[PDB]
């Protein structure tokens, strides 16, 4: 009583019901480094300008 599969059927992506748990860390990765702090706050003008040796702006 076995029916041979049609062209296209064995290449389908199927769904599988398993009782084993999903691997939470399959790459066995350690903790990622903490990122650098982002920029935040309002952008105020430079205090007394460029401060390049004698320029006042």
């Amino acid at each position: 009583g076995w029916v041979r599969p049609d062209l296209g059927e064995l290449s389908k992506v199927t769904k599988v019901k398993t009782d084993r748990p999903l691997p939470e860390n399959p790459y066995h990765s350690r903790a990622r480094p903490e990122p650098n702090p982002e920029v935040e706050g309002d952008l105020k003008p430079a205090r007394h300008g460029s401060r390049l040796f004698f320029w006042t702006m």
Partner: protein, 63 residues
């Protein structure tokens, strides 16, 4: 000019230039620390963008 005017104008000049000098010294120390530690917004040299990684199931499982 009155001596009062030149005196207090000198005080305004001295305050501005002392504040600029303190900011230059702080700028040198900030640049030194950020180049040494790499934890600031400056001296951030590029690494590879992780958004380029394909996370799809590959042809072989062990990857």
């Amino acid at each position: 000019d009155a001596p009062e005017k030149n005196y207090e104008r000198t005080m305004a000049i001295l305050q501005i230039e002392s504040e600029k000098a303190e900011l230059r010294l702080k700028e040198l120390e900030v640049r030194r620390l950020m180049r040494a530690k790499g934890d600031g917004p400056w001296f951030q040299y590029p690494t590879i963008d992780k958004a380029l990684i394909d996370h799809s199931p590959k042809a072989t499982p062990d990857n």
